[PDB]
Amino acid sequence: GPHMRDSTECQRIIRRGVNCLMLPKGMQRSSQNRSKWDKTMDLFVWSVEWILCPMQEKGEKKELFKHVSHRIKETDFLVQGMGKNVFQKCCEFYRLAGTSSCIEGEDGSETKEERTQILQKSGLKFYTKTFPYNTTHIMDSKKLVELAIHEKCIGELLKNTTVIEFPTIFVAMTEADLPEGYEVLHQE
């Protein structure tokens, strides 16, 4: 059944260092969120929102592809949360090609890195929504940050952050390919 929520819900829960701002009962963003502890893995899982951003010119802009992907582990890397659909759609958006490694002695790490290789060899960059460290109440703000999906996992990425309900990932070649009104933050 649906989770315990109010109308004009107002709470912040912290889950292994991620600050999570709770949306009210009727929000489609709270309805489409599936995130909990899962006994079957003895860890926390997320639903997450992915946006693939296509290669535009400086006059001709092109339109985004969106996908929400589910039951992604706090231990997972982005390429293991994205879904084969989002991986295959990135391969068709930028015309990336597939490769192989670690065949000398792996059967699970070889294919974890198979996906990540396509993104680092194309030079694709990944970004997420950030909100302030002291935030206790729900807000909307266009603020992105660039992150190292080839070195960092999703749990340590979100451990330093604030997010509303369930987190969002933007995929693009540059800031100049990212959607309008959104901006990426740099160091001081």
Side-chain angles (χ1 to χ4, degrees):
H3 304 100
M4 189 287 189
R5 295 181 189 263
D6 218 330
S7 294
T8 188
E9 187 60 270
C10 58
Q11 290 179 96
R12 61 116 66 161
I13 54 159
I14 296 76
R15 292 286 84 96
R16 304 198 71 229
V18 193
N19 305 322
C20 298
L21 319 186
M22 296 290 93
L23 283 177
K25 56 174 59 184
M27 284 289 189
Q28 187 178 358
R29 289 191 80 88
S30 82
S31 301
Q32 80 192 123
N33 183 13
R34 191 292 214 194
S35 54
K36 215 62 60 207
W37 183 281
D38 250 337
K39 312 298 193 183
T40 199
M41 312 192 276
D42 198 69
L43 56 72
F44 281 108
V45 302
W46 315 92
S47 294
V48 318
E49 181 181 48
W50 304 87
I51 303 88
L52 278 162
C53 313
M55 285 172 309
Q56 38 236 248
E57 301 179 38
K58 69 185 185 184
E60 277 177 65
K61 41 264 168 276
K62 317 296 160 180
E63 54 166 273
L64 315 170
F65 172 88
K66 302 193 78 193
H67 192 270
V68 177
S69 308
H70 304 281
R71 61 178 168 81
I72 305 175
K73 313 173 207 59
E74 66 170 310
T75 63
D76 279 347
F77 287 76
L78 286 295
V79 296
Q80 328 184 262
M82 77 195 321
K84 68 167 177 180
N85 186 33
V86 182
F87 170 76
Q88 284 175 258
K89 256 67 176 68
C90 92
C91 293
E92 95 175 73
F93 264 37
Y94 318 95
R95 303 298 175 195
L96 309 332
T99 63
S100 55
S101 53
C102 298
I103 310 304
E104 297 290 57
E106 297 297 1
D107 282 296
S109 304
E110 63 108 313
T111 189
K112 176 187 165 200
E113 79 176 33
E114 173 179 22
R115 302 285 172 243
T116 228
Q117 280 283 320
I118 319 313
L119 284 317
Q120 71 182 235
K121 83 195 306 288
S122 59
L124 274 167
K125 294 184 294 183
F126 290 69
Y127 309 89
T128 193
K129 286 271 286 299
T130 180
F131 291 87
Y133 189 85
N134 290 4
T135 302
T136 49
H137 299 105
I138 301 70
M139 56 183 290
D140 188 23
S141 190
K142 262 126 180 175
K143 306 269 82 167
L144 274 45
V145 283
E146 188 189 321
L147 81 320
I149 72 165
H150 312 310
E151 291 285 288
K152 175 156 60 184
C153 72
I154 197 172
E156 296 287 333
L157 176 274
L158 296 172
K159 174 140 192 169
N160 316 125
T161 69
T162 303
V163 291
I164 295 58
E165 195 57 48
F166 77 110
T168 306
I169 306 297
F170 290 89
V171 189
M173 283 293 185
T174 60
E175 297 177 65
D177 303 301
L178 289 176
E180 79 198 324
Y182 301 88
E183 73 181 295
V184 184
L185 308 185
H186 273 247
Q187 71 179 277
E188 229 78 83

